[PDB]
Write a protein that binds this ligand. Sequence first.
Ligand SMILES: O=C1CO[C@H](CO)C=C1O
Ligand SMILES: O=C1CO[C@H](CO)C=C1O
Ligand SMILES: O=C1CO[C@H](CO)C=C1O
Ligand SMILES: O=C1CO[C@H](CO)C=C1O
Ligand SMILES: [Mg+2]
Ligand SMILES: [Mg+2]
Ligand SMILES: [Zn+2]
Ligand SMILES: [Zn+2]
Ligand SMILES: [Zn+2]
Ligand SMILES: [Zn+2]
Ligand SMILES: [Zn+2]
Ligand SMILES: [Zn+2]
Lengths: 881, 881
Amino acid sequence: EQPAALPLFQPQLVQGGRPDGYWVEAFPFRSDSSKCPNIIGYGLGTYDMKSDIQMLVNPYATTNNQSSSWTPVPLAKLDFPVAMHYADITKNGFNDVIITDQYGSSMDDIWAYGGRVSWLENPGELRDNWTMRTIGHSPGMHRLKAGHFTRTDRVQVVAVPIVVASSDLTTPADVIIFTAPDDPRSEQLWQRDVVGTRHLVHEVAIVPAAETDGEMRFDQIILAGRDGVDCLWYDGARWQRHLVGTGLPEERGDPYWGAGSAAVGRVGDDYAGYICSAEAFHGNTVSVYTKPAGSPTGIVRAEWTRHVLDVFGPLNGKHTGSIHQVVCADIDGDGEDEFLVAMMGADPPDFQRTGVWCYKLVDRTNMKFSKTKVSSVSAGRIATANFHSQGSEVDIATISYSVPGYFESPNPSINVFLSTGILAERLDEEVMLRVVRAGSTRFKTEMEFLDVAGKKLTLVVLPPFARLDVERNVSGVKVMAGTVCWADENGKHERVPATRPFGCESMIVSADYLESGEEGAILVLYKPSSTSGRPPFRSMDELVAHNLFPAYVPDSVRAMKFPWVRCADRPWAHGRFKDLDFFNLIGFHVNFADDSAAVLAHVQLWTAGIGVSAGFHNHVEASFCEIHACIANGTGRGGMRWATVPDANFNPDSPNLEDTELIVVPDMHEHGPLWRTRPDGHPLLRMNDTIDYPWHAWLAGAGNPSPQAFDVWVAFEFPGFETFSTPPPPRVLEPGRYAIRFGDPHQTASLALQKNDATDGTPVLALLDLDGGPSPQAWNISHVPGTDMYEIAHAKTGSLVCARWPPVKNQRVAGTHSPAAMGLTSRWAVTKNTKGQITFRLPEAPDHGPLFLSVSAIDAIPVIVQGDSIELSAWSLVPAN
Amino acid sequence: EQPAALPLFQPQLVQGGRPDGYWVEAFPFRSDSSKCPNIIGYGLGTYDMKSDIQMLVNPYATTNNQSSSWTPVPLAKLDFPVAMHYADITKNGFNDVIITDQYGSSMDDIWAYGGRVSWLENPGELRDNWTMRTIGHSPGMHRLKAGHFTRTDRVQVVAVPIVVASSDLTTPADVIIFTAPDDPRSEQLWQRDVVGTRHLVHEVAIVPAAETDGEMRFDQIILAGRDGVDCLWYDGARWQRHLVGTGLPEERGDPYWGAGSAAVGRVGDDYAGYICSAEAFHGNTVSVYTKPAGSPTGIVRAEWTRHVLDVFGPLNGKHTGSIHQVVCADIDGDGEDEFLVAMMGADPPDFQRTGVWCYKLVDRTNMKFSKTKVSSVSAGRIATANFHSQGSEVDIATISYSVPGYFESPNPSINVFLSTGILAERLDEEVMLRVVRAGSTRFKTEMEFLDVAGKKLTLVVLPPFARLDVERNVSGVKVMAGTVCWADENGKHERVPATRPFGCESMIVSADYLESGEEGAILVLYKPSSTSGRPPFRSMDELVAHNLFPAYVPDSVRAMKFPWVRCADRPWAHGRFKDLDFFNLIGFHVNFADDSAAVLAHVQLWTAGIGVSAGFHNHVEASFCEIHACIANGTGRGGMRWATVPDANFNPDSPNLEDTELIVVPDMHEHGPLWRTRPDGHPLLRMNDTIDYPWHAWLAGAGNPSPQAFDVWVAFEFPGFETFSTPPPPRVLEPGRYAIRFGDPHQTASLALQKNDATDGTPVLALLDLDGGPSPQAWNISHVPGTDMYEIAHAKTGSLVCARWPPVKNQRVAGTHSPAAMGLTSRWAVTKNTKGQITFRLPEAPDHGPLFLSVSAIDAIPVIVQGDSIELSAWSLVPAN
Ligand SMILES: O=C1CO[C@H](CO)C=C1O
Ligand SMILES: O=C1CO[C@H](CO)C=C1O
Ligand SMILES: O=C1CO[C@H](CO)C=C1O
Ligand SMILES: O=C1CO[C@H](CO)C=C1O
Ligand SMILES: [Mg+2]
Ligand SMILES: [Mg+2]
Ligand SMILES: [Zn+2]
Ligand SMILES: [Zn+2]
Ligand SMILES: [Zn+2]
Ligand SMILES: [Zn+2]
Ligand SMILES: [Zn+2]
Ligand SMILES: [Zn+2]
């Protein structure tokens, strides 16, 4: 339902210091699979250096991968290669390369016997130098694609020259269809028909038949050139043409007009929601062609109108600019394509024209797009695929544009940008993990990080309602943001950031899978390990932890060790904890990736051997709300104590254990909040802005340390938030859509947002349900995860019912998307009276009474908070829509 | 005084995808200057490819630099080059290259007519291919250095073969001194004397005469090889030898022992505080040689003892490992050298053996060292210099170790690591700036970031007591951490993070320079600009801001635009601020670089045209302590209002201006805190953990917006801290070293830390100043910047006098390096009685009385806090030492 945010990108330098650069392609070794494909990259070479067509091997294809290196394999070595594509010609499950070469060095140096089109035979294993067989020749051959254009039982290739001879920008060239013979393995010329003639075709794009949802039997050909952008397709019996548009208008003395490039973008069920374009040849102009809303799906049945989106600046003496290609891909996984624009770079340099721009369709109705910079290093061509994982995330690969006589990007290279919801950076001894918001990602991301105590601690982000397969009764989880859910014989089991104060949850997932809630989830997954020991842990050498980060995280992170250090030896000990078998392991900041850089939670680990107290403390030093999750309980008796006396009354240095209560925290459990809270759940704060705690500590089970057995536990340090209430109030309400009514079996009125106006600070009222009145306004009432409170949000606008500052007797009420922190004036405790009427109470402020949502009288009645009159605060809830 | 922390490093990839790799050198073009020198890098080549000796041009040499590219210049092209150095042979101010080539491909393939030693003549401008003249030949020539070894009036070169012929690891080779002739510009052989014979010399290091503080007239030669590490030097009349040590002991069947490498490390005034070493040839062993404390400075006068520091793992079938070089450099600028260890990499791969380890001398007395990973990409050789700035920061450059027949690091390259106290990362629309702690850096760092409103906003970190030259009466400053100071006709002027509540400081520096205090400083410097307009700013096009980040920050940051956006259009507007000339510019997180990743301050900007109110608000939404600094006041009347009535009494939507007070904030001023504070300065907190503010707003001066004039101001959002007191108490105390005494002209006792024990929680007492008693303990009393409070810290240990939790009547007192946040129980308000006796009062807690530092009676008297008896809380301060 909610707008999708962009993922994060982890850059990896695939191959650097290239001699030249021009083409890059996502190359699946097999035609059955599209997982972790390889990359093919090259440049045109020169008259001295034949160009190496390099098939760079994808590290993350080999399972349990350690390498970040892309092993280059020379597929072939060729005089001026230009364009390429692939398909399974031998029809054996292996992808063959099809490539144009013998082009020449420029549109001014065209080889008259050249423009060779050849295919390279995939031997089914990674050897170099593949067998080459010629398909055909046509001078100036400059782009091609494989597919099924007039038949399905055989590979066909469409191939087009940009010009027919040196310096000739006026003669149109032949749109050529080559057909595989029955035994392509005999050297012989491939059958050819010419299917049209065009001026300066600079790009060929294809729409596979399968994508058209039964509209076409064959692939459509989309040409961008001086004639503009058009669609060429075969119906079984004939070729036909449909003009999409004419592209840049000509200007005298400039031989370049029309289009340089074009792609077809999916929007929902329509494989062609729009067509984007770059203009003209190597131009600086981005435009999009649209079709009236309610148009038929596809290309040929709609008339298209051109809208210019940006001009990235003027052109030079050669009449060129900085745009070489556009492509479409679904970058944020919301089911509509974004488009990428390959910025070659400029002379003099200009970041605006270097790298990749990603344009998002923000408004499907008005066809408005907005742009974001994805990368700022030269992009001469762009390829998309998922280069690292099984899901439908989309990574971007690029190659610097460096071509003698056009533009030569300094330090030319191939890079890939790995889409991910988790990015890792070394700080010093601890790692910074930046995470996307779960609510707005459409992608699951897992990143393993530490192998310790029989477990692989894995950071996982889940999108709303996503599913996670686990190992029943073995896999453990700990929620840091959001909620996750599972079902067994007993019903639903939900995990939030913190369970009920002083409580104790099992982390073990007893089902075959879990699912995240409405807001998605961010959690630590405890995967069973065999590489980090088995309890009971009798010594600290047994608990040596191993770096788990995957090969695409940066090297300085992969190189990190996380040792256990005796607490006495940490720089914060100051002579404390001498002689204690008490150890610490740091550490991991999990923080939001967005512009807030807000903390999610800091995470670190501890151990204690038999009889060891971790020392009573109270967190006056630094502010946070801590939850612990024990991995191994040395004795089955270790756990948390807190003092039950006031603080003056307890001596942390010589503790009177009887003034404490113990909560055993068993293998793979987590405990509830121990800090002091106000009754609706807000945390008590000390005078120096720290969360207020009673004296507390982790104590290992007593006994003799022989044989030894270590407690091992993880610490989750959250910033302040509202938790559960004291006492826990009864459940008297279902989340749902409702009309909220006041009055009796005689004359009633309903809760309303004045004129349904979305503006922050719009008043909330009771509108008399009149004779021929408006119908009652719908409110979404919902439960606040990890609390006993509810929020009321306007069904149409989203606006939360909220008391104006400050919440006092007789205070007005309004709508807002700008709640106070911890929703102080926009959350509610519910009671149900014996009649069935609902009351909504504010968090009770320090020195004032309870304040309830209320009418002020008996043509709108205004809505205040007050607490003197029961009668004015009783509401009836009618399910609404 | 305080231990120096390491700086940060910004990596830059100097030259990637190299064919091979071996040597890197910091190469100053002129011998007069060492600023922003160039880099020389190469490998040995092969029998096919002569090796390019590349002089890579340093971008940051050209002033106001835009480029991050290192322009390669082929100096020469040579059969198997190995070692090199430089000096001014032509004696013209230009640095000439001296290089050994014609080596062969390996110790098994030594050219019998090779080992050529040649110099390359610096034409005084960056042309390629320099003139080459042969100095001499000796087969297997493998290392050399230039310097003055037997004379000063002429360049001399020491040159040494590692072996004399193919596969011969037993024949020792000649230590050769070459001397420049008087006219080196005539091709002729250079005069040679042999000065010794050694086995497997793998490194030559040099100590310039000038570094020895008059100990030597000539340079010392330090050789590492199978004979170990030794020193060879000339006294004017003879050569002499001093054995430092024998290095790795031989093990049978392994031809490698002794040392592979060695460097000489400064410690304070001693240019040779230690000698570090790597063992043996291409070995895996790091050791250090030490001299007894109280030894004479230098090398030849002390006996040296070897201590093995690490073994990084076993050796292979060739008997080699991963260490190629050690060097010394002063990395953290504290006046003692660290040493770097060049890790070649390993087969199979191992991060432990790849990159650079940096070892720090942590304990000068016991010669203990500890290590940190600085980089994890192959380092075959390491060069140090300051590649980017004028100060004495030290950058590290490296080249991958890739040599056919030894080890070939995949994807070989040259990288440099730029030392800096500020690192920049793009988040999304805002930049993350990570900063070092000022207290522990020895380096000034400036990084310009935004050119706006006639100013270049520059982030600056200053070490303690550092000096900053500025433009008198033009330069403006705003302190974010620490303090800075200046002097004019009126005395000292100090700037802290926030001035007195409701006050108004000028930011203009009226002196020629400022200085940071004891804790250093982190500040924004407002440099005058001509590239961002001139007030009055009549339209927002006038205030277009420009990205200022320097060329070594990453590209994705350099490519960022920071537009002004109308507040109505921001995603947090929710229909507010329609029709207001009210704009916003985001944005910059300044956060601590260390493992805490703690916030320093978030920074963003605003404008308002005539008559515009920025809207009354109270910060219930998000917690922070805000200070604003106006850059331009549209009218000279713009500024901050707050309400002076309680919050219930003020309507932010229809404000009654008379219930407010205004503080005009003139051009280049900043205002004091507007939030509510407890009387000793701790901030009032609301129930949802937000800093408590009265209704407040920025209002532009009234009038007609024609002609228009914009207020422009910057917002500093700090996390909570203690500010000044209400009312401001009188100054009755000087910071200083003191004995703290109780009693009368009859029998007295002084404040003491029990047994001067540094442990957290040691008791504080009053020890009767006895007959033959201990002397009175010294306390450092000091003023807490930005507050009216004092801290008492034990002069010997550092321990703060601090009341145990909770601060109540009769609470004990102790020492701690672990204060409560905002020093709640370890800071003090001072009063002076008419006698001259001092009282120390705690911050007054919500519901308890004042509590004073006190004795409990009239053989130690314990020290409590209490507040019933004046008499028990009066102290005498005697200046102590
Ligand atoms: O992008 C290129 C590269 O150069 C060739 C030569 O004309 C044509 C293009 O379109
Ligand atoms: O969370 C904490 C806090 O620090 C103690 C050590 O005193 C132990 C923990 O588990
Ligand atoms: O590091 C190297 C490289 O290889 C030569 C050839 O023996 C010698 C060394 O010391
Ligand atoms: O600091 C603030 C807070 O936000 C307002 C806009 O209401 C303006 C500022 O300067
Ligand atoms: Mg095939
Ligand atoms: Mg010279
Ligand atoms: Zn092109
Ligand atoms: Zn999308
Ligand atoms: Zn705790
Ligand atoms: Zn070597
Ligand atoms: Zn140092
Ligand atoms: Zn404010």
